[PDB]
Design a protein around this ligand. Structure first.
Ligand SMILES: N[C@@H](CCCC[NH3+])C(=O)O
Ligand SMILES: N[C@@H](CCCC[NH3+])C(=O)O
Ligand SMILES: N[C@@H](CCCC[NH3+])C(=O)O
Ligand code: NA
Ligand code: NA
Lengths: 295, 295
């Protein structure tokens, strides 16, 4: 495909009663279009997939598409830890208008490598939308290694992989086993720029939510081989790459977005909780240092 | 209250079409009654909670209670990584006939300590059935420590905790922070005898699916202070404590039970896969050495 560069793993904004705040979601979409983000992932981990039941999950993906109105690709979150639940989310998104789907490996139940292969083959067989694989063993408790991802490159609608391990040596291992056309996205903001420098195609990012302009600049420059401009853009925002993780994503990034006036309400669904006050100064400082206005 | 000793985290047997095999489920319950098991957990991790949707999950818990006919306590699995979803599962089990519910900590979304407290408090508020907490960081990516668990002891119907860390020093730390009335169950067969000796109340176990008589003996001896008899019973089955984890549980134990003829078929739901041929000889040996008659 040609989906690449700076991709935002969008937060799902909520109202005071915990229902989805569609007005803010629309404003987030316009914001990304204006700021130059390359694509939007709806209902990934950053979008709190776990606490959206299926009907709400697909309503969010569907409305995100509708707000985009052809101006930016939207990629639908479709991972599950039951192969059948993943097919069901896929099928429900077939008619949506989504450029692609992003599916985390099964979490918590720890499938073997052949189970991962069979899981994603079954999900790919249920659609012709492109599928992007997503490895994050720090949350799922399985590390889907390059020699497993490799056995899936042959599926014609499996087009790429979001790897969040921060292990940048995996770019070369993945390039050698998957070819030049398999799309490689960093899911780890802190190593993102290096990950592009070594050969990656793009970044599906948290920090994106709040610094989309500089992040886009960082990414373009790194893809273009202009490393000084890439490091110079990274420099400004780098503190966010730890501060947005003082408590689990998206607890911090949701706080930042509310604090900035991007979304009406800071509400987040249990078992996640609002950023605790002991980290508020830490984050506010990192936001100032990233040139984010207010307060 | 009075649930302690050897508790089996029951496998969920399936037909070769992947539907639930209630004829083998019934046979499993009778077997445990015969062999002296103290209680059954239905739809824990070992029971494939992940790949059972909510209404099958309830069907399994409810049939298990029915087969038990008041002859052995049944504990219902009610963990979820969304608080609302844990509530729904708890509410559906309220009039099933369970003695207790077992709830794993939220997995994959990594809530903070205060989020865990809020989650379990909300879940406990929706029922009058006793609630056992369940910590397994190796699967969930969140480690709920003694200090956090201590703050839930006062909740009147949260009666104890299944810790699967294999960190046996936590028995002492949990006793000191929770008191003597909080029930402490080991979730880790390899350290279960030791966990009992150091003060625990019971074991919620994988191995006792296939060696229930010996595992009970070991638990009874350990609780009664007869460490020689506990150690003699452990010695005979110890091989199973690593052999049953050669792939993620319940992959091996489900293969073992089929191989023994406890269940009609060895089917398991995607993304989980049947035990790999390469481990067959290893587990068959560990089985013979535990005195299981291969059928
Ligand atoms: N909370 C469950 C169900 C999610 C339903 C779709 N977003 C999970 O993380 O798998
Ligand atoms: N596969 C999802 C849904 C579970 C449905 C209830 N057993 C999860 O692991 O949470
Ligand atoms: N996220 C929860 C919401 C509660 C159930 C809605 N009927 C679920 O996955 O089911
Ligand atoms: Na491909
Ligand atoms: Na209590």
């Amino acid at each position: 495909h040609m989906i690449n560069g700076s991709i935002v793993a969008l937060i799902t904004p909520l109202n005071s009663d915990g229902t989805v705040d569609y007005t803010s979601l629309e404003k987030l979409v316009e914001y990304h279009i204006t700021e130059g983000t390359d694509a939007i992932v709806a209902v990934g981990t950053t979008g709190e997939s776990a606490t959206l039941p299926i009907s709400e999950h697909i309503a969010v993906v569907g409305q995100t598409v509708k707000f985009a109105s052809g101006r930016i690709p939207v990629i639908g979150g479709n991972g599950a830890n039951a192969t059948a639940e993943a097919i069901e989310l896929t099928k429900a998104q077939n008619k949506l208008g989504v450029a692609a789907m992003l599916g985390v490996t099964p979490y918590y139940n720890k499938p073997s490598p052949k189970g991962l292969i069979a899981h994603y083959t079954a999900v790919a067989a249920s659609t012709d939308i492109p599928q992007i694989l997503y490895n994050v063993p720090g949350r799922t408790a399985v590390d889907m290694l390059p020699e497993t991802i490799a056995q899936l490159v042959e599926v014609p609608n499996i087009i790429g992989v979001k790897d969040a391990t921060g292990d940048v040596a995996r770019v070369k291992q993945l390039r050698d086993l998957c070819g030049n056309d398999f799309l490689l996205y960093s899911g780890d903001d802190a190593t993102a720029r290096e990950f592009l420098t070594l050969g990656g195609d793009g970044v599906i990012s948290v920090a994106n939510n709040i610094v989309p302009k500089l992040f886009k600049l960082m990414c373009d420059a790194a893809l273009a081989g202009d490393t000084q401009a890439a490091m110079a853009a990274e420099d400004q925002i780098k503190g966010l790459f730890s501060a947005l993780f003082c408590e689990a994503n998206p607890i911090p990034v949701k706080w930042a977005a509310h604090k900035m006036g991007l979304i009406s309400q800071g509400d987040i669904r249990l078992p996640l909780t609002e950023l605790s006050t002991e980290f508020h100064g830490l984050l506010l400082d990192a936001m100032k240092n990233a040139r984010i206005e207010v307060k």
